[PDB]
Each structure stands twice: as C-alpha cells, then as structure tokens.
Amino acid sequence: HMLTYGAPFNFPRWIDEHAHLLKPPVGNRQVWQDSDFIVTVVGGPNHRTDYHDDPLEEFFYQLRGNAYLNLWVDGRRERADLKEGDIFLLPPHVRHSPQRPEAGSACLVIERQRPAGMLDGFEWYCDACGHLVHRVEVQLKSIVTDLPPLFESFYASEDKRRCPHCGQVHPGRA
Amino acid sequence: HMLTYGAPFNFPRWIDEHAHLLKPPVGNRQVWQDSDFIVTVVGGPNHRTDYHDDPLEEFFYQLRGNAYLNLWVDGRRERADLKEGDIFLLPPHVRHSPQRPEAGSACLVIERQRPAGMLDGFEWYCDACGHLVHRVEVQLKSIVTDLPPLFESFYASEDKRRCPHCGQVHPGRA
Ligand SMILES: N=C(C(=O)O)/C(=C\C=C/O)C(=O)O
Ligand SMILES: N=C(C(=O)O)/C(=C\C=C/O)C(=O)O
Numbered sequence A, B: 001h002m003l004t005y006g007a008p009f010n011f012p013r014w015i016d017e018h019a020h021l022l023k024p025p026v027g028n029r030q031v032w033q034d035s036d037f038i039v040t041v042v043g044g045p046n047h048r049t050d051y052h053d054d055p056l057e058e059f060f061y062q063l064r065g066n067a068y069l070n071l072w073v074d075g076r077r078e079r080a081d082l083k084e085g086d087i088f089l090l091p092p093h094v095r096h097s098p099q100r101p102e103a104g105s106a107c108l109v110i111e112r113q114r115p116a117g118m119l120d121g122f123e124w125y126c127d128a129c130g131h132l133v134h135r136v137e138v139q140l141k142s143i144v145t146d147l148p149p150l151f152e153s154f155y156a157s158e159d160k161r162r163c164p165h166c167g168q169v170h171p172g173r174a
C-alpha cells in the first residue's frame, strides 16, 4: 500500500510548467504513467482530420481557452463547443475530432486503459459525400507511441485517402 | 450514437447552482447518472471516521477550498493534503478517509463503476491500538443509497465498534 502516483500537487502550476509541451509539435502531456485512469492535458493550437472511436467514455474539462469537438451524432455532423470552464462526458463510440485552435489553452481529458482485445478506432470521412474513407483499429497502449505512425500512413497513401463511394481523394493533413 | 449525457456545460456555474447540496446533510452530488465514469463534486463541512477501500483508482481535483485525506500508507497513518488547486491520483485499495472541514469547498472526484463481484470496503480503525475494528464489503451501485445504512449500523452497534484487540469501543460518529 503506497502512493504509487505520488502526492497531491498544484494543477495550475503543473500546467504552467509544461506549457512548452502543450503546444506544437506535440500538444499532449499525460499526467501520471501506468495508471488505469489515463489523465492528460491537451494544449493548442492543434487541428486534426481524424475521428476517434473510443470503446470507453472520455471526460473533458476545458480549463483554459476554448476548443470544440467535431462529432458524428445520429449520422449528422455536429459540433460540441468546449468553452472555457465547460465539462463534458462523451459516451463510448461517438466519433469525435477535437479541434484546438487557441494557443495557451488547456483541457483536462480523462480516459481508461483499454483491456486487451478492446480496440480503438481512427476514421476519416469524405468532405464531399460523407462516406467513410478509411478506418484503422489499434490496441492502444501509448497515445504518443501508437498514434503518429497511424495518421502518418493515411496521409502518405492516396489509396487510403480515396473515398470508396465518390472517388474523391481525402486531403490528408488539413 | 447520441450524447447520452448531454452537451458540455459550464462547471463553475453548475457548482454554484448546487451549493445547497454541497453542504450538510448530504455534501455529495453526482454529475451524470448511469455512466461508467462516476463523476461527483464533494462539498463541506464533512468529517467522517470510516476508511474506504476502493478496488479501483480515484481521481481528485480540489477546485475550491481545502481538504485532506487520512490514509493508511505502508501500515502508518498518513495525511495527504488537498490544497485548493491540487490534483491527486489514488491507487486501488489505499484506505482513505476524506476530511472536508471548509464550507464552500468543492472537490471533483472521479471513479469507475465497479464490475459485478468487485467489492468496496469500508473500515474503522481503533484510536488506541490501531487494529482493525470493523469492515463491511458492499457491491456499490449507488453511493447515496448503499452507504448511509452501512455507517449507520456501525454507529448503532457497540459490538461492531468493539476493538477485537484492546477491547476499546470505537467512538462511532466523531
Ligand atoms: N480526446 C482526446 C483523445 O486523444 O482521446 C484528445 C487528444 C489526446 C489526448 O487525450 C483531445 O485533443 O481532446
Ligand atoms: N472519495 C470519496 C468516495 O466516496 O469515494 C468522497 C466522497 C463521496 C463521493 O466521491 C470524498 O469525500 O472525497
């Protein structure tokens, strides 16, 4: 019986201290390692084109600045704003694409470790017809070791970007 | 695919609005119902004598005011302060007794639904010899429907309060 994750510590100060990691190139920072609760602060600017299909819930608390989530709810493209001060609970499998335009912003995001055999999805959809263009499923163990080469190989492949329904080649990075 | 838990909403304002529930007699308020993430704000004043043995992690973010956790770490009685602004990740099964002396305080506490057969513990220890006095295990489904009658029946029973090791009868409520 030990405090495997250390003592309590001041959160605004920790965010301040890691501001240089809460901006490009990265923009993520996991707070504690090897815990069941995956607790992360997400900065900005970042925009992305992928949608996440998380088989478990995600919790958001927009501490500083504003962000928004592009979503598919009920087959329609829908946007949930994370204004500063907002909290939000995302149910499993709602496809979501976080957009974080502001520098200096910071969002508490809490998730759980996925059990073996429970897989995450990353999807791109066609700007033109809305059809699914590409999905990869991954056994997520480390958000920053598993995810870059996924996105990267979608961007690298016109065939992965080619819409099966209208032939439009998804743009890729932006 | 729907936002089963609604849209994002301003958290400081929600805390303000429910301040009358974040004070005795209760002092708890779960944010969303029937979710895997059990997300709750805990107010004050509250003191309590029981220790919780949670088979899963708990996450704390002391948003307003100050609190502390009485703990058993490594067999010794240890205190972790939750100063305002502190966050903290508690590993499974560390016994903890939250003390919340300040009125107006507010602590984000996040836990997961326990699977069937994974049981919570509530323990009292002897002021005089430190030995365990009483433990109840419960299949926790609702923090406010399962817990009061537990504590209440410990307070009601001198035999449950009687230390098996030194005979001292635990004081009960305070
Ligand atoms: N919602 C997520 C996620 O990846 O699951 C996130 C980015 C990474 C860290 O949580 C974000 O930008 O909000
Ligand atoms: N740590 C808990 C818990 O019961 O598990 C809590 C009280 C109730 C709601 O979380 C608290 O006062 O901090």
Ligand SMILES: [Fe+2]
Binding pocket: A052, A054, A058, A096
């Ligand atoms: Fe996600």
Ligand SMILES: [Fe+2]
Binding pocket: A126, A127, A128, A129, A130, A131, A163, A164, A165, A166, A167, A168
């Ligand atoms: Fe298309």
Ligand SMILES: [Fe+2]
Binding pocket: B052, B054, B058, B096
């Ligand atoms: Fe607890």
Ligand SMILES: [Fe+2]
Binding pocket: B126, B127, B128, B129, B130, B131, B163, B164, B165, B166, B167, B168
């Ligand atoms: Fe005793």
